[PDB]
Write a protein that binds this DNA or RNA. Structure first.
Ligand SMILES: [Mg+2]
Lengths: 469, 407
DNA sequence: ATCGTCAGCTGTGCAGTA
RNA sequence: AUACUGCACAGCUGACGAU
């Protein structure tokens, strides 16, 4: 048997003034963001210790004027950050206001530090932080995005040396405030400090140098503060209207219950790309990663209603990505919930990250990004690999490629859908990295499920994506 | 004259050597005296207007200055460095040796304070070719400035997929019988004959491919209810549970076959094979077609602090999964290591040295590992033979020829 | 209620990406 | 917790087989 293969060109993304480039950093540098900001200032708030507030201000004033990257071996992999001055990528200024200076007390950290019950320490720490943030939101000093950068002293007596998380219930509680939060471990804002790891206590974590962290955190802060999207994937000329839904899975904070997760995105009329979640919690029925009928039907109803509310028309094509097997328990419900609304095209793809076979080529380098092989219906696609642009391989071992398994109800061929998700992988607003592997709806649903894993019942969830990355 | 005619031959023929790819070449007027026709890059015939100035020179025949089989040097003039300055386009110089029709070029990036002039050509890695052209073509892009890059330039490569075409026997035997498998192992363990397992007892049925009566499996199959059936009619089912039963049959079939040296494996990774005295192999003779090479298939490495005791013994392993490919069964091979204390118990700590080995590893050793690991697998009741993994043709070529090796 | 074969799912963690 | 990849380990859901 001879297997047909395919090579896809690296996709280009939209930017300001109808620009098109394949690199988010360079696309922001030449053109600016896709949507500009009417205001010219973004207000930042700091929560933590006095030293951490100081070094957060030092971090902002350090990266305002621009800080270069790393060695000259790969100039395309670590571009310099041109700062926030005259030639800002975001064309806005980022200021810390004087009314948001939340400094914690050493007596409280001595108090919480007591570890009789580890669970109550996490709960009362998170409750006191959220109470102080709520007290800050009440006054006339509302920030836009709050850095809540944790100190070494509090975190080491709650995370490693004591088992619940921190980020999960912390963002589960920071849900009524009219601004998102961003946790910053102390190494990011101050590079002189070294924080030891938990299990290999002799060893410790290693991070990037300066500017990659600067790029990722500044893009995250801009998207959280302004609310205007930095980039989106460029639509093709003469293409139909499409809608992307993704479904992921998780386990709760108990023994034997699984609760599932979802995410959703589409396009706007003028120039935009929405990306949201759902305001309703998902309950449990069993422990297999399955969907039943009413869950899939109400997911499709929600996403179609949210498209119709924005475009005043139903979409012409629905694209759904899952992680477990696409069986007939829920595919009948999906297809019925599509045909009651008259949407013609329909694609349903199971994504497998659990395979047992790879592809081997000559030389010391593996296959490039986007290499496609067709296994008689299976769509084996390498969403990572070597880079003609980054100039090298950013990894150690052979990458585990995605296995496309389209459902037999799907419309398009296995080669078009892989190119579509190959375009869809680089719409990660967390970072500016190019070597994304999982597609963005599965990634977004995983983030939503990780946040919703610890949400208490009766709490209203937010569909705004700024509280998730 | 003669050398003038040789030069006018050489410029046209290096024009042709540029023309064998999408590397469109243009000529020059009469009165220039220091640069010749200019080369322009196109990918697949589509221009993007990237330029290289080229200067031609040519000889007829003979050994060059200090010429060897792998390298040869040359001398350069003194007044030409002003025009050989690393200008807006690099000035690549080329020479012709007509005898083996060779077109020599060496990189001209930028002259500097040394001013060594001359040339340091090698025979193998600085010749005009369709294999190392990206390293040729990555010169006009400067180090300063970001966003400029050149795509892969032509060529092709034949890759492969780690798969084994197995040759299954045509027929196998179905037998309905008593002696449920716990009683079957309880009666078959105390034996000295051919107590070899290649069956699944499912619903009180045997489903073997070797003769059950003519072995130590006589008591399980009894003296009757033994027949034969071709494998093709019952290979295709509508019930996926029956397909899983056939996969169970395949695994227990190989469990006989791959019980060659030290099989009978407990984890999902099979092939625990090893040695008996020094616990080394140094084996899997891969004869190839130009030379044979050996690799440490079973490896013994002493610890750093203590040298008189063997720290860990290394073996190779794989995990089969038995995926049919449109009514055709292939074996999926997934290579992995097996650190062991001595042969029977898992090692205490060996993970960070495997990760360290993977850290300095490439994917070149993987493919070579798979081909040497199949060169042994191609060689009574068991056929113990296997075919060849398939190969595919790539549209594009990896630009590693224009890059530097990792570490 | 465990046990090989089966194929897969999530949870909770450690290097550095040239 | 600025991102992402690879290794290592442990658990639970549906069609399979027993003393
Ligand atoms: Mg973030």
């Amino acid at each position: 048997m001879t297997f047909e293969t395919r090579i896809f060109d690296e996709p280009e993304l939209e930017f300001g003034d109808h620009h098109h480039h394949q690199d988010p950093r360079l696309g922001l540098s030449e053109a600016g963001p896709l949507q500009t900001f009417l205001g010219d200032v973004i207000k930042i708030g700091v929560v933590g210790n006095s030293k951490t507030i100081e070094d957060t201000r030092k971090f902002i004033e350090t990266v305002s004027s621009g800080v270069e990257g790393k060695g000259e071996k790969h100039p395309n992999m670590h571009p310099p950050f041109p700062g926030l001055g005259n030639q800002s990528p975001y064309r806005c200024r980022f200021e810390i206001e004087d009314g948001a200076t939340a400094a914690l007390t050493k007596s409280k950290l001595d108090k919480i530090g007591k570890e009789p019950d580890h669970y109550r320490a996490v709960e009362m720490a998170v409750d006191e932080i959220i109470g102080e943030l709520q007290a800050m939101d009440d006054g006339g000093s509302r920030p836009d995005v709050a850095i809540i950068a944790l100190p070494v002293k509090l975190l080491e007596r709650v995370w490693n040396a004591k088992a619940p998380n921190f980020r999960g219930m912390l963002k589960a509680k920071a849900m009524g405030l009219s601004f998102p939060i961003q946790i910053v471990w102390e190494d990011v804002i101050d590079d002189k400090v070294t924080i030891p790891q938990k299990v290999k206590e002799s060893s410790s974590r290693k991070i990037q140098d300066i500017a990659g962290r600067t790029w990722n955190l500044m893009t995250s802060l801009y998207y959280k503060g302004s609310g205007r999207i930095p980039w989106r994937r460029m639509p093709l000329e003469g293409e139909f209207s499409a809608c992307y839904v993704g479904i992921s899975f998780y386990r709760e904070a108990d023994g034997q219950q699984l609760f599932t997760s979802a995410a959703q995105m589409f396009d706007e009329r003028g120039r935009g790309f929405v990306l949201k979640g759902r305001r309703a919690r998902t309950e449990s029925r069993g422990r297999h990663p399955y969907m039943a009928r009413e869950d899939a039907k109400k997911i499709i109803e929600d996403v179609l209603a949210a498209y119709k509310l924005h475009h005043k028309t139903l979409p012409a094509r629905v694209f759904i990505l899952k992680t477990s097997r696409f069986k007939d328990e829920e595919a009948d419900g999906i297809i019925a919930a599509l045909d009651e609304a008259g949407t013609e095209l329909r694609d349903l793809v199971w994504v497998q990250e659990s395979y047992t076979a790879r592809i081997l080529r000559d030389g010391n380098y593996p296959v490039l990004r986007g290499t496609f092989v067709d296994l008689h219906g299976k769509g084996l696609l390498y969403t990572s690999g070597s880079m003609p642009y980054y100039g090298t391989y950013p990894g150690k071992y052979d990458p585990n490629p995605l296995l496309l398994c389209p459902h037999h109800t799907s419309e398009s061929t296995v080669a078009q859908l892989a190119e579509e998700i190959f375009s869809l992988t680089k719409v990660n607003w967390n970072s500016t990295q190019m070597n994304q592997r999982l597609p963005i709806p599965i990634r977004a649903a995983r983030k939503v499920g990780e946040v919703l894993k610890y949400v208490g019942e009766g709490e209203v969830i937010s569909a705004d994506y700024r509280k998730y990355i | 004259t003669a050398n003038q005619i040789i030069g006018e031959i050489g410029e046209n023929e290096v024009r042709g050597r540029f023309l064998t790819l999408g590397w469109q070449f243009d000529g020059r007027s009469r009165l220039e005296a220091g640069i010749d026709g200019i080369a322009e890059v196109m990918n697949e015939g589509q221009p993007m207007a990237r330029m290289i100035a080229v200067q031609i020179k040519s000889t007829k025949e003979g050994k060059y200055t200090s010429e060897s089989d792998t390298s040869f040097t040359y001398l350069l003039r003194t007044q030409d460095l002003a025009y050989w300055r690393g200008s807006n386009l690099p000035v690549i110089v080329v020479f012709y040796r007509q005898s083996d029709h060779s077109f020599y070029w060496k990189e001209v990036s930028r002259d500097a304070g040394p001013g060594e002039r001359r040339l340091n050509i090698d025979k193998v890695a600085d010749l005009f070719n369709a294999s190392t052209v990206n390293k040729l073509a990555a010169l006009t892009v400067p180090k300063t400035g970001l966003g400029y890059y050149v795509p892969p330039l032509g060529g092709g490569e034949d890759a492969l997929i780690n798969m084994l075409p197995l040759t299954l026997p045509n027929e196998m035997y179905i037998a309905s019988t008593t002696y449920e498998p716990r009683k079957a192992i309880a009666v078959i363990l105390n034996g000295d004959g051919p107590k070899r397992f290649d069956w699944v007892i499912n619903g009180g049925t045997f489903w073997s491919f070797h003769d059950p009566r003519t072995s130590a499996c006589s008591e399980i199959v009894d003296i009757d209810q033994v027949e034969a059936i071709n494998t093709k009619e019952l290979a295709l089912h509508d019930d996926i549970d029956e397909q899983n039963r056939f996969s169970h049959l395949l695994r227990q079939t190989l469990r006989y076959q791959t019980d060659s040296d030290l099989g009978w494996d407990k984890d999902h990774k099979a092939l625990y094979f090893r040695a008996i005295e020094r616990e080394v192999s140094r084996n899997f003779a891969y004869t190839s077609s130009k030379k044979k090479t050996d690799a440490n298939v079973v490896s013994v490495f002493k610890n750093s602090k203590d040298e008189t005791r063997v720290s860990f013994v290394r073996h190779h392993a794989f995990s089969p999964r038995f995926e049919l490919m449109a009514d055709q069964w292939y074996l999926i091979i997934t290579p992995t290591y097996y650190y062991t204390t001595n042969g029977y118990a898992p090692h205490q700590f060996a993970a960070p040295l495997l990760a360290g080995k993977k850290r300095l590893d490439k994917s070149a050793a993987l493919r070579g590992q798979v081909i040497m690991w199949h060169r042994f697998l191609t060689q009574p009741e068991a056929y113990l033979m296997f075919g060849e993994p398939p190969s595919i043709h790539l549209d594009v070529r990896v630009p590693e020829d224009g890059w530097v090796k990792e570490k």
